[PDB]
Amino acid sequence: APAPFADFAPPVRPQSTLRRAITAAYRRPETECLPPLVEAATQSKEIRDAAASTARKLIEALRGKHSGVEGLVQEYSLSSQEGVALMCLAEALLRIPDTATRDALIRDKIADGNWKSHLSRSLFVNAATWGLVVTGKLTSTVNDRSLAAALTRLISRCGEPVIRRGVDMAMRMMGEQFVTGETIREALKRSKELEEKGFSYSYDMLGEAATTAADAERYYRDYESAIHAIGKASAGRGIYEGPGISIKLSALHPRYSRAQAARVMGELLPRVKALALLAKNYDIGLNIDAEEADRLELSLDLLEVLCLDGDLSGWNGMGFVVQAYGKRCPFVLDFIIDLARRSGRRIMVRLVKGAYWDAEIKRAQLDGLADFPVFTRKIHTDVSYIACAAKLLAATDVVFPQFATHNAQTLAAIYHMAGKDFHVGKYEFQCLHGMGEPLYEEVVGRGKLDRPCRIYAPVGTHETLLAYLVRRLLGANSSFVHRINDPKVSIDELIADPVEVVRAMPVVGAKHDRIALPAELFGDARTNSAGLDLSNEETLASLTEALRESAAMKWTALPQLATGPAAGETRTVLNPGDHRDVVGSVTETSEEDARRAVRLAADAAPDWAAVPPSERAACLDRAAELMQARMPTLLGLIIREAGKSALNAIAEVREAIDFLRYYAEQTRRTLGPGHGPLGPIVCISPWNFPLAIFTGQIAAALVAGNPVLAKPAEETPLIAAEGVRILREAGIPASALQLLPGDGRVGAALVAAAETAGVMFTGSTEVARLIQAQLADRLSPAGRPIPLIAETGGQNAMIVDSSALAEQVVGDVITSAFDSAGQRCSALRVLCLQEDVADRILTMLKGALHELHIGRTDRLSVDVGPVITSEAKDNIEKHIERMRGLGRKVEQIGLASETGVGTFVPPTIIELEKLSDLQREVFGPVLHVIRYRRDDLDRLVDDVNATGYGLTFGLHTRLDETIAHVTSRIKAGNLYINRNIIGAVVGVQPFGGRGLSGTGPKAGGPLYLGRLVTTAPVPPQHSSVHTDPVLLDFAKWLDGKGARAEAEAARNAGSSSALGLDLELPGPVGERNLYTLHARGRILLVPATESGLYHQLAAALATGNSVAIDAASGLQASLKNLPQTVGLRVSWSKDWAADGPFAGALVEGDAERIRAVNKAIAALPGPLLLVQAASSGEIARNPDAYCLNWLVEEVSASINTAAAGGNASLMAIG
Amino acid sequence: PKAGGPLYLGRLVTTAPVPPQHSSVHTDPVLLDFAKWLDGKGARAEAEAARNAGSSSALGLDLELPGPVGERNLYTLHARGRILLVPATESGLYHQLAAALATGNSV
Amino acid sequence: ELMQARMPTLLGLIIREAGKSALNAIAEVREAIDFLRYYAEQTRRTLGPGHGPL
Ligand SMILES: Cc1cc2nc3c(=O)[nH]c(=O)nc-3n(C[C@H](O)[C@H](O)[C@H](O)COP(=O)(O)OP(=O)(O)OC[C@H]3O[C@@H](n4cnc5c(N)ncnc54)[C@H](O)[C@@H]3O)c2cc1C
Ligand SMILES: NC(=O)c1ccc[n+]([C@@H]2O[C@H](COP(=O)([O-])OP(=O)(O)OC[C@H]3O[C@@H](n4cnc5c(N)ncnc54)[C@H](O)[C@@H]3O)[C@@H](O)[C@H]2O)c1
Ligand SMILES: OCc1ccc2c(c1)OCO2
Ligand SMILES: [Mg+2]
C-alpha cells in the first residue's frame, strides 16, 4: 500500500537556482517587478531622441499609406450589422466548394430573395469574429435575429452586386489575409515575393489545444508534413535566411498540463523531438510558441531536455517564445540564456508581449490566487519588453533574439538599442502576416533600416482560421495597431517612451486601478477566499509536505454534545480510493444522545440568541480565517476521506470560507432584534461536499442566532468534525454547535426531537421526502410548520447547438460530468447535442474521456477519484448495465488494476434514445447523450423540464435567439451559458434549484438567512419596481366586490413583492452573473375563510404565481366573476395530487387544521412544497402572515462572456 | 404605422422591407407551443411557417433612439392586442394564427 | 434644404394663416424638414427593386 501523498506531484527535475528564480516571480507584486525593468530598459537621451525620431518616421510612413471591408460598407451604405451579416453570408457561400455552383446559387436563389431557404447551422455562427472585423468591437454572442434582418434588408436593397462583392472580399480575407495560404504549398508559393525583399517566414499550421489523442496525432502529422514542405523549399538557406515552423505544445498532446507532467515528458516530448529531428535535417527553425501562463514552466522542462539531447546537436534552429507581459520573463530569459550556454545551442528566442492577457486576468480571479502572472497595465508590458530586449541583446553570441512586435515605438527603441553593427543572424524582428507588413516594409531592406523581419504565417482552411481568430485580432483600444488607425491619437502619443512614463509615475508599477486582485473581487463586502496554484512548484512542494503531514494525523469524529464528547459505537473511516488507507475513526451518536443534544440545544438557545448578530458574524469570519490558514491540512483530509482531487478539495475549502464570510456579511447587513431565531436547527448534510455544504448550513443557522445540531453524512464525519472544531475555536460555544456523527438514524432522531425548530437538509430527494413526512406531524409551540430547507438532487442537462465550439463544449462536458466522478449535485447528467454536430462532438467527447486518469486521489495526476462506497458503486453499475441491456451504446474508460483496492466506477458515456430513458438521478460518473433536431429545441426543453428536477442547466450556443428562447423556457435554479455547469460560487451563483431539486431558498444567496429566523429581514438589494398585472386586476376586482381591506392588502402585496428583481452580482471578469426573482409556479391554496382566500390569492398573484384552490374549502362563491386575467391563473382542485406539481402552498386554519393539511401536502407526489400556514386571526393581524420571500423562485444565470475568445470590457483596460 | 417611425414607408409599397433595427431575439412562447402542436399534427408546412414567423416577428424590440442629452427616447414593439381572423381554409387559419401568435396577439 | 433656407418666410405664412406663434411655427417647419430627411434616409436604408409602389 503506497504511502499517502508520497507521489503527489514530484517535479520533472530538481529545480535549479535559475528555475527557482522563475517560480519565485510567478505572481510577484507589480510594484516589485517594474523598477528592475525600468533600469534595464533605460537608454541614453541621445538614443531616446533617435528612437523617437525613428518611431515618428515609421508612424508617418504608416499613416501616409493607410479598408477592404470599409470600402464595401461605404459603397453599399451598409450598416454595421449589414456588414457583419454580409460577411457571414459570404463565409457560408465560400463553404460551397464549386465556384459555378456558388455563383448559380447567388444569381438565381440568394440574390432573388429567400437566402434562408438555401443556406442546420446558423449563417451567423462566426458573426462575433466578423463583428470584430467590421466594427473593431467584440461581442460574446451573436444577435442572429438582427443579422438575419440586416441580411434580408441588404440583399433586398442591393441584390447580387453586394453579395458578389462580399464573397470576393471574404475570399480574399480568409484565403490571403488571415492566412498566408490554405495549405503549406500555397503559403510557400506566396512567400517568395517578400522573401525576395528580405523577409523570412515562420509557418503556423494552426494546431492548438488538442482534445483527443486523434487530434494530437492530426496536428503532429500536419507539422511533420509542413516541415517537409518548408525544408524542401528552404533548400539549404538555413535557419536565419530560410523559413521555419512554429508549433504549440498544446497541439501535440491532449493533456498538456503540469498535473500531467509525467505524460507530457513521456508522450509529448518524443513527438517534439521527432519534429525537431526533421527540422534539424532540413536545417530550418522550429519555434515553440508560448501559451497560457500555467504552461510556461512545464515547457521549460521540454526545452531543457531537447537542448541537451545529443541527437539534435549541430542544429541551432530550436526556438522558444517568451512573453514580456509575464512577470517571470526576465528570469525565464536568464534560464534560457544559461541553457544555451550549457547546451551550446544558439536558442532562437522570440520575444513577444503575449496573447492571452484577458484570459490570464480571468483565470487568476477565478482561482483566487495571490496576484496575476501578467502585468495589468499595458505600459508595464512595454517596459518589460524593452528590458528583456536589453538582456537578449547582451547575449547575441549565445541566443538569437527575435523581436516580435507591431509597435513602432517598441521597434524603434530596440533598433537603436541594438546599434549600428548588424549582420544577418545577430537578431531579427518578427511580425504577423497580413498585419505587420506595412510597418516592416519601412524596416526591411537597405533603403530602410536594413533589418530582417520574419513573418509569422498562419496556414489553414477557413474552418481552422476562424477557430481562434478572435484572440489574434485583439485591435483592443490599447493596441498599437488600433491606435495607429485612430485619428484622435497623435504621433507624439504613439512615440511616447513607456520607460520614462513608468519611471515618472508616483508609484512605479502600481496595479491597474480597474482590475481587482482576486482577493478583492467583492470589494468592501467581504474578502474572497484564496486558492492555491497547482502549477507553482513552490506551492506543490509545500503542499506535498502539508498533505503528507495531514495523513499522519489521528483524525477523529465524536459526538460533541454541549456537555462534552460522548461515547458510542466506533469504527474506522477508510479512504474510498483504497480501503487499506485508514483515514480516521468515527464514534457515532446513539439516538438517546441525539435527543439529549436537542434538549441541550434548546436549553442553550437563549444564551446564543443573546450574542449580538455582529459578534456571531465575527465568529464566522474568524472561522473563515482559520479555514484559510488550515487549507493545506484540510485538503489532505478531504482528498483521502471523500475521494476528491486536490483541485476539487481546494474548491471545497474555498466554498466553506466563502459561506462563512458571505453569511457573516449578510448578517451584518440584515439581522436585528426583531428577527428572532427559530430555535434548535438540525443541519443534515451530504457526503459529497463534506465541508462546504456542511459549513454553509451550520454557519447560516448559527449566525441567525440558532443553536445547531450538526449531523454530517456517515461517509465523511472527519472533515465535519474538523469544521466543528474550527467553528468552536472561532468562538461558537459548544452549546451552540453540537456535532452528532452517525447515519440516517441520527438525522431522523434529530428531526423527530420535540425541540427541533427547523431543519436544513441537503441530500437526496428521497431522503428529503422522508424528512418532509416526519415534519408533517409537527408544529412549533406557536402551532406553525417547522421550516425545512431541503436542497436535493438534479437531472441536469446541457443543450449544445451547432454554433457552439466543440473543443469548448467537450472541456465543459468532461468537467461537468466527470469531475468528482460525477458526485456533484450539479453534475451534468444529460448532454443534448443538435443532430448536425452530434457525431463530431461525441467522437471528441469519447476521445477526451479516454485521457482521464482514474485512481486514488493523493496524486496530482488523478482526474477522477473513487465513488464514495461500494453501495454507491453497485447502484451506479446497476444503472449502467440496465442501459447496456436495453441496447444503448456505452463507452467506458478502462480502469487500472490499482483501483481494485477502492470503489471506482469508470467515467461512462451512455447514448440514449429519449430523455425518458432516465428515471432518477444517478449520482456517479455517468453521462447520458441525447440528440435533437434544431426545430425540436422547444420540445427538448419541455423534456428536460419534464423530469421534475430543476437544479443546474447548461447551454452552449453563440446565438442570442437561442439563449433567449432556452433560458426563458427552462425551469432550473442555476443556468450556465457557454461554460461548465458546476462549481457555483457563493454570492455569485447563489445555488439551489426547484421542483425535485429544492425548496429553496438558495444557499449562498440573500434569502437564505431569512428562512432561519421567525420574522424574515429585508435582504440587501431585495425589491422590485414591477407590479404583477394580474395582482392589480385582482385588487380592482376586490374593490368592485366591496372587499376594501383585502384590495388594499392586495395592492400592498403587489408593491412588497420582489418579483422581477434582476441583478448582476459582482464576480470575475469575463463572466456575467445574474440573479433574478421569478414566480414559483402554481401555489396550492388551502383557505378557511373568504378573507383568508383573498389574502392568499393576493400573496400568490403578487409573486406572479398561478394557484390551485382547495375545492373542499367550499369558498367557490367567493371568486365569482373574476376578470379573465385572474381566472386564467386560478384553478380549483378537489384532488390535489392530480393537479400538481405545485411549487408551494399557503394554508389557513387553526393548529390542528394546519397539521392535517400539512400531512396531506406532504403526501402529494413529487416535489417537497414550501408550505406557509397562518390562522385567520394571524392573517387579520399581520400583513406578512404569508411571507412573499418564499413565493418567488430565485434563478441564477452565469454567462461566460469570454467564450468568443476574448473579453470585450477588458479591451478598454490598458 | 407611426409617422416619423421606421415602419411607415413599408405601408406605402406592396411588399414591406425590413426596417432598420427591426428585429427581436424574443420568441412568443404561445407561438412556440402552436408550432409544436402543428408538428404533432403533421402540418409540416404550417409548423415551418409558424417557426419562421416566431423568428421574424419583432415583438419585444426595445430600442433607445438617438436624441438630445437629458432625455431617453425609447421605442418598443408590443402585441397589437386581439386580431380578428377571417380564414377560409384550415391551412389559412393555421398561417393566420402563426402570424398573430408570433406577434404576441390573441385572436 | 429649401425649407430650411426659407424658414423665415414660411414662419410668416404659418403664423398668419394657422394662428401659430413664432416658436410653434419654427417647430412646424423643423418637423417638415425632419420628415423629409428622415423618410429620405429610411428610403436609403431599405427600398429596393422588389418594394414596388402602390
Ligand atoms: C510574429 C509574432 C509571434 C507571436 N507569438 C506569440 C506566442 O507564441 N505567444 C504569445 O502569447 N503571443 C505571441 N505573439 C504576440 C501576441 O499575439 C500579440 O501580437 C502581441 O502581444 C502584441 O504586441 P505588439 O507589441 O505587436 O503590440 P502592442 O499594441 O504594443 O502591445 C499589445 C500587447 O500589450 C499587452 N497588453 C495589453 N493590455 C495590457 C494590460 N492592461 N496590461 C498588461 N499588458 C497588456 C498584451 O500582451 C497585448 O498583446 C506573437 C506576435 C508576433 C508578431
Ligand atoms: N441541491 C444541492 O445543493 C445538493 C448538494 C449536494 C448534494 N445534493 C444531493 O445529495 C445527494 C448525495 O448526498 P448523500 O449521498 O450524502 O445523500 P443522502 O440523502 O444519502 O444523505 C444525506 C444526509 O441525510 C442523512 N439521512 C439519511 N437518511 C435520513 C433520514 N431518514 N432522516 C434524516 N436524515 C437522513 C444522511 O445521513 C446524510 O447526512 C445527491 O442526491 C445530491 O444530488 C444536493
Ligand atoms: O498572433 C500571433 C501569435 C503567434 C503565436 C501564438 C499566439 C499568437 O498565441 C500563442 O501562440
Ligand atoms: Mg445515503
Automatic annotation (TrEMBL), chain A:
InterPro entries linked: Ald_DH/histidinol_DH, Ald_DH_C, Ald_DH_CS_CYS, Ald_DH_N, Aldehyde_DH_dom, Bifunct_PutA, FAD-linked_oxidoreductase-like, PRODH
Record's catalysed reaction(s): L-glutamate 5-semialdehyde + NAD(+) + H2O = L-glutamate + NADH + 2 H(+); L-proline + a quinone = (S)-1-pyrroline-5-carboxylate + a quinol + H(+)
Catalytic center residues: E791, C825
Boundaries of every Proline dehydrogenase PutA domain copy: 69-178
Record: residues binding NAD(+) 3: S685, W687, K711, G763, S764
Cofactor: FAD
Compositional bias (Low complexity): 1-10
UniProt-annotated binding residues for NADH: S685, W687, N688, K711, E714, G763, S764, E791, E921
Pathway this chain belongs to: Amino-acid degradation; L-proline degradation into L-glutamate; L-glutamate from L-proline: step 2/2; Amino-acid degradation; L-proline degradation into L-glutamate; L-glutamate from L-proline: step 1/2
GO cellular component term of the entry, any: cytoplasmic side of plasma membrane
Domain Aldehyde dehydrogenase positions: 569-1006
Binding site for Mg(2+): A1162, L1164
Enzyme superclass (EC): oxidoreductase
BP GO terms, sorted: L-proline catabolic process to L-glutamate
Classification via NCBIfam families: D1pyr5carbox3, PRK11809.1, PRK11904.1
Function: Oxidizes proline to glutamate for use as a carbon and nitrogen source.
Protein name, per record: Bifunctional protein PutA
Automatic annotation (TrEMBL), chain C:
Family designation: In the N-terminal section; belongs to the proline dehydrogenase family. In the C-terminal section; belongs to the aldehyde dehydrogenase family.
Residues of the full protein shown: 644 to 697 of 1233
Protein task: Oxidizes proline to glutamate for use as a carbon and nitrogen source.
The protein's name in its UniProt record: Bifunctional protein PutA
TM segment ranges: none
Organism: Sinorhizobium meliloti (strain SM11)
